[PDB]
Amino acid sequence: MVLSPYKLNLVATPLFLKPGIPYPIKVQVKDSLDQLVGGVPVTLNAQTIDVNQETSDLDPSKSVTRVDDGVASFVLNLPSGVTVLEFNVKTDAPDLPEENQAREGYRAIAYS
């Protein structure tokens, strides 16, 4: 492997915050051969920025990629005045060191 054996990609997760609707995040984990891999832990961290430039850190969430589609799912519930949601997903495979875990960051925006 080089850097990491896993590649993270969002599926069915548009980076747009819709008001009054929960925000779902679905992450797929592939290998170097573009093959889905299940049973991989995925930890999600998030941070919200509102209209008053105030910052809120969420509690980390954990999911596992399924064996039928290699997808890990999260659902976040955000306050009403949130404009930006900066989140990141990282693998936590028990056979990989900390430095060799796949990590990816995304930024969802509210309408403007």
């Binding site: 779902p24 969420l58 509690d59 969430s61 954990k62 999911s63 999260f74 659902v75 976040l76 955000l78």
Partner: peptide
């Protein structure tokens, strides 16, 4: 205002909303 709890889907689980 209190929000709904955030969900981390486990194995064999789903979200009904």
């Amino acid at each position: 205002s209190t929000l709904c709890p955030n969900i981390g889907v486990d194995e064999g689980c789903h979200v009904e909303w």
